[PDB]
Design a protein around this ligand. Structure first.
Ligand SMILES: CC(C)CCC[C@@H](C)CCC[C@@H](C)CCC[C@@H](C)CCOC[C@@H](CO)OCC[C@H](C)CCC[C@H](C)CCC[C@H](C)CCCC(C)C
Ligand SMILES: CC(C)CCC[C@@H](C)CCC[C@@H](C)CCC[C@@H](C)CCOC[C@@H](CO)OCC[C@H](C)CCC[C@H](C)CCC[C@H](C)CCCC(C)C
Ligand SMILES: CC(C)CCC[C@@H](C)CCC[C@@H](C)CCC[C@@H](C)CCOC[C@@H](CO)OCC[C@H](C)CCC[C@H](C)CCC[C@H](C)CCCC(C)C
Ligand SMILES: CC(C)CCC[C@@H](C)CCC[C@@H](C)CCC[C@@H](C)CCOC[C@@H](CO)OCC[C@H](C)CCC[C@H](C)CCC[C@H](C)CCCC(C)C
Ligand SMILES: CC(C)CCC[C@@H](C)CCC[C@@H](C)CCC[C@@H](C)CCOC[C@@H](CO)OCC[C@H](C)CCC[C@H](C)CCC[C@H](C)CCCC(C)C
Ligand SMILES: CC(C)CCC[C@@H](C)CCC[C@@H](C)CCC[C@@H](C)CCOC[C@@H](CO)OCC[C@H](C)CCC[C@H](C)CCC[C@H](C)CCCC(C)C
Ligand SMILES: *C/C=C(C)/C=C/C=C(C)/C=C/C1=C(C)CCCC1(C)C
Ligand SMILES: *C/C=C(C)/C=C/C=C(C)/C=C/C1=C(C)CCCC1(C)C
Ligand SMILES: *C/C=C(C)/C=C/C=C(C)/C=C/C1=C(C)CCCC1(C)C
Ligand SMILES: CCCCCCCCCCCCCCC
Ligand SMILES: CCCCCCCCCCCCCCC
Ligand SMILES: CCCCCCCCCCCCCCC
Ligand SMILES: CCCCCCCCCCCCCCC
Ligand SMILES: CCCCCCCCCCCCCCC
Ligand SMILES: CCCCCCCCCCCCCCC
Ligand SMILES: CCCCCCCCCCCCCC
Ligand SMILES: CCCCCCCCCCCCCC
Ligand SMILES: CCCCCCCCCCCCC
Ligand SMILES: CCCCCCCCCCCCC
Ligand SMILES: CCCCCCCCCCCCC
Ligand SMILES: CCCCCCCCCCC
Ligand SMILES: CCCCCCCCCCC
Ligand SMILES: CCCCCCCCCCC
Ligand SMILES: CCCCCCCCCC
Ligand SMILES: CCCCCCCCCC
Ligand SMILES: CCCCCCCCCC
Ligand SMILES: CCCCCCCCC
Ligand SMILES: CCCCCCCCC
Ligand SMILES: CCCCCCCCC
Ligand SMILES: CCCCCCCC
Ligand SMILES: CCCCCCCC
Ligand SMILES: CCCCCCCC
Ligand SMILES: CCCCCCCC
Ligand SMILES: CCCCCCCC
Ligand SMILES: CCCCCCCC
Ligand SMILES: CCCCCCCC
Lengths: 231, 231, 231
């Protein structure tokens, strides 16, 4: 484990995702509202999945070597197995908050799968220049997601209860800022141009992951928007 | 790229799926009917997924070598990753058109997963004679799907609006004819008996894919069956 | 095939899953109740999936070698591909029986995916002591599932029709007893401590699989709880 300088950030990430999972699990014990139960189930699964994948990276299972640039490059593939399941769950939290229609939910989840799937292909591609073709396709899929979150959901939240509109607006802004950083870290990190070393890259993804999952969840599960209007 | 004679058909397929995706995306911009939005989302995702997998084959990522018959045989595995997601989406288009019940939808999607999954196992199997055992199981799963589309959905469409009944009947006939060709191309192509060479096999799958996805989508999204009855 | 002593139990399992699939398929022909159709579709898919994965193990495709303990250990990875899809389908049978809320269904299916996913990682892990870390995480996920089936569903079934309450109680008890045996067989078998040899381990999993899928299905599909109350 300790033979890799980035191990400290993988261990911290593992701990923070595990602690986040347990807090949400305990906090959700005393909840019977069927609407609130939906948000607790979605939001608790997110850091639980991330916990297992951070642990796999810490123990060395989620790491492979990819030859490109005449070098064997360490690629943590477990990140994409994490994101494949956690990013659509996070979008479902937002879509259920605004009572989005089914067709829009399917478009979001499908574009998200394309985003993560093409990012994985780009991470494992051995022809250096082709890695950035996949990065560009994946980034186009992300821009579609961000467009929908702004010019489809925002207008839908305003016609909703005030507390669900204000909570959505906050979580929307958090998501757009944090998610946009991921393609940048990829491009300048060891998967892309190799400007930033792997140990610093790992620290950046850990800050982003914890903020986008545990920070996101703390804002959502403390809001009254997750409960139905009741007397 | 150009070192493979089949590259021209992979490049054409990539272009036609990309163009198809963009047309459906633009055409769906001016749509607010929640029913129509469902069909546009399903139908636009189909060629978008196929685009990415054709590109992976063009660039050489979606290709592996499988030893059988005393030879290293080029097997494009990316086809099955495509079909795993696009064939159930196409069946969902048909099932939603006739307002099929949930139990029937699950049976269709499950049989479809078995069809594609066993076809993938057959494509990667190293014992030559066993490849055709998997082909037979996969073909049995397809025949179940075709039976349901005829002796379960057809009777359901007649009790529906006339425009949804006539549109379903057309898309049903297109699907049964085109899908039935796939097991035949597999059997006589490089995955099976090896009668037809890979470059011709690739041309045939490209014609079938574009017809079953973009041609299918053009018929559906030009129909009024996708809109609810409104004044 | 016959070069492996466990082949006899893989062949028996294949036959019993295939026969089970055909019986459920025939029995479900004469069913039009939309509620009953749901249970028949879920319950017939379970042994059909298991059939294909037992066949892959029989023919040698679903087997790999994992080095640990200074030895190349035969690991049947196809079991986890089976369980990944069949265990959530079995939980869906139970959840639909008691009309569970959506949030609870998602929590069950998500915990089940974590259970199977971490068990697969543990089966393929090359550092011997780490294999049991994954076993423990997977077992914690199972205990969560069992808790929900007892202290969330049981109370919900009592407020239901008497026949659905008594049928659920029976299937609940069958599930908790049979599922609990799996982590024990893993721990003492070739994936874990290696006390029980592989051929005996394979026999035990076959008895458990057939009971948990075909036996489970025979109890459910003979009950009147799967039909709506009708005159
Ligand atoms: C009902 O809706 C509320 C349940 O949602 C919340 C239910 C959760 C979604 C269930 C998923 C958690 C499982 C219990 C998994 C247990 C293993 C975890 C990875 C444990 C990690 C923390 C600890 C080991 C440090
Ligand atoms: C509606 C939305 C959900 C739609 C989703 C969008 C999606 C279509 C976007 C594209 C996804 C696609 C790129 C997934 C590729 C997975 C692949 C990286 C797995 C590893 O295989 C890659 C190479 C080794 O580098 O295999 C070496 C050769 C091996 C012999 C490969 C044989 C196994 C194949 C991988 C079998 C295909 C399985 C499916 C891809 C499983 C789904 C994986 C997940 C990442 C989507
Ligand atoms: C709301 O419902 C309508 C949206 O459906 C339609 C929405 C679509 C389903 C969203 C999926 C498309 C994404 C925007 C993916 C973008 C990358 C594409 C693969 C681009 C391919 C064409 C071009 C690069 C040649
Ligand atoms: C309700 C419906 C959706 C049900 C679906 C029906 C489905 C059950 C039908 C059978 C599907 C099954 C054959 C999928 C097999 C995937 C497999 C080809 C992936 C590549 O692995 C094959 C060998 C190399 O040749 O791995 C070499 C050895 C490696 C060490 C393998 C270890 C990884 C395992 C593959 C882990 C299992 C992952 C799941 C199979 C992922 C789903 C893939 C998709 C193709 C279903
Ligand atoms: C409508 O709801 C009822 C259909 O459910 C029941 C429908 C089933 C869920 C459909 C799935 C079965 C498919 C027909 C697959 C056929 C291949 C099987 C694996 C055959 C195995 C048995 C035989 C080959 C020994
Ligand atoms: C809501 C719920 C459904 C959530 C589900 C819970 C889930 C997150 C729990 C953890 C699942 C995770 C451990 C799955 C790992 C699959 C992995 C074993 C496949 C084989 O790859 C392992 C190594 C060889 O030993 O690959 C060698 C290196 C290769 C180069 C690997 C590159 C391919 C990657 C495997 C791509 C990721 C694909 C996804 C993991 C596909 C889903 C598989 C299924 C088992 C979940
Ligand atoms: C909890 C994890 C989250 C919210 C991860 C989000 C990840 C992304 C938005 C990743 C995007 C990428 C691109 C847009 C292209 C480059 C490759 C990716 C996958 C890093
Ligand atoms: C857009 C792609 C489509 C509609 C693909 C359809 C593919 C099939 C219907 C494939 C069927 C197969 C068999 C029936 C057995 C032989 C292997 C397959 C997977 C080619
Ligand atoms: C039809 C198959 C069924 C119902 C299989 C159930 C399997 C389990 C409940 C497996 C549980 C495991 C653990 C709890 C940890 C050890 C590894 C597993 C996956 C065997
Ligand atoms: C979206 C965030 C990207 C900003 C990356 C900042 C990295 C600064 C760290 C110093 C770079 C290390 C280079 C010298 C080793
Ligand atoms: C009462 C609110 C705080 C509860 C404690 C939460 C502990 C989980 C770890 C959170 C750290 C990361 C927060 C986002 C920066
Ligand atoms: C379902 C369509 C299958 C028909 C295949 C027709 C192939 C004819 C092309 C000529 C065969 C090439 C053999 C000589 C190289
Ligand atoms: C107005 C209808 C035609 C629009 C142009 C569609 C261009 C997408 C490519 C379609 C070619 C394949 C059609 C099926 C044979
Ligand atoms: C949950 C069931 C686990 C019980 C396992 C009993 C196995 C007894 C078979 C004899 C053990 C073989 C050891 C000598 C070869
Ligand atoms: C009339 C009920 C029996 C029908 C025959 C079922 C045959 C399928 C194989 C069942 C054997 C396994 C039963 C569970 C132990
Ligand atoms: C490729 C993996 C995608 C599945 C991720 C799991 C979450 C799916 C959310 C589905 C939302 C409901 C759509 C109607
Ligand atoms: C194995 C991958 C299957 C999933 C394909 C994605 C489409 C799923 C459609 C689900 C239809 C809704 C069923 C109720
Ligand atoms: C185009 C939709 C408007 C909202 C999206 C904001 C774009 C942020 C740019 C992200 C940069 C990634 C490289
Ligand atoms: C048996 C259901 C009737 C409709 C299915 C038509 C069968 C077409 C044969 C396809 C040939 C594939 C080898
Ligand atoms: C803790 C929830 C109560 C019901 C679960 C029964 C636990 C059975 C123990 C299984 C042993 C697996 C190692
Ligand atoms: C080795 C660098 C080659 C540059 C390729 C950049 C491709 C980016 C595509 C974005 C449209
Ligand atoms: C090398 C050819 C061996 C023939 C096997 C055919 C199997 C087909 C099974 C269809 C029932
Ligand atoms: C080689 C045996 C090492 C023992 C590790 C046991 C780990 C079990 C963790 C359960 C909390
Ligand atoms: C609940 C605390 C979980 C912390 C265990 C993971 C941290 C790795 C320490 C080496
Ligand atoms: C929108 C046009 C997309 C065409 C790019 C793919 C074709 C491959 C050319 C080499
Ligand atoms: C319907 C009977 C299915 C039996 C075939 C599988 C058994 C393997 C025999 C070698
Ligand atoms: C993106 C930063 C999240 C901050 C988490 C703190 C929330 C406390 C209510
Ligand atoms: C299967 C052939 C499809 C033909 C596509 C043309 C549709 C234009 C309306
Ligand atoms: C767990 C044992 C199941 C027994 C199956 C027999 C059911 C006949 C109704
Ligand atoms: C109005 C809410 C502002 C939230 C933005 C937070 C950016 C990290
Ligand atoms: C909408 C604000 C985008 C912020 C992008 C930050 C990328 C590091
Ligand atoms: C490929 C772009 C299509 C141009 C608009 C077609 C008419 C909606
Ligand atoms: C009555 C519609 C006929 C459609 C059949 C088309 C076959 C390619
Ligand atoms: C229902 C007509 C079937 C046509 C099969 C064509 C196979 C090449
Ligand atoms: C009251 C029903 C008892 C069922 C338990 C069966 C254990 C195999
Ligand atoms: C609730 C009874 C548990 C039985 C466990 C059996 C494990 C072999």
């Amino acid at each position: 484990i300790t033979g890799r300088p980035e191990w400290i950030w993988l261990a911290l990430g593992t701990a923070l995702m595990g602690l986040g999972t347990l807090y949400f699990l305990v906090k959700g014990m005393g909840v019977s509202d069927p609407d609130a139960k939906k948000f607790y189930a979605i939001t608790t699964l997110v850091p639980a999945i991330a916990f297992t994948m951070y642990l796999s990276m810490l123990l060395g299972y989620g790491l492979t070597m990819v030859p490109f640039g005449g070098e064997q490059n360490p690629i943590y593939w477990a990140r994409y197995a994490d994101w494949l399941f956690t990013t659509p769950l996070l979008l479902l939290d937002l879509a259920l908050l605004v009572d989005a229609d089914q067709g829009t939910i399917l478009a979001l989840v499908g574009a998200d799968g394309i985003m993560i799937g093409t990012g994985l292909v780009g991470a494992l591609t051995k022809v250096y220049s082709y890695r950035f073709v996949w990065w560009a396709i994946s980034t186009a899929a992300m821009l579609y997601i961000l467009y929908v979150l702004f010019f489809g959901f925002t207008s839908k939240a305003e016609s909703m209860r005030p507390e669900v509109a204000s909570t959505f607006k906050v979580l929307r802004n958090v998501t757009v800022v944090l998610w946009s950083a991921y393609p940048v870290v990829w491009l300048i990190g060891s998967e892309g141009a190799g400007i930033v070393p792997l140990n610093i890259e790992t620290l950046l993804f850990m800050v982003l992951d914890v903020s986008a999952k545990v920070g996101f969840g703390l804002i959502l599960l403390r809001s009254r928007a997750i409960f139905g209007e009741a007397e």
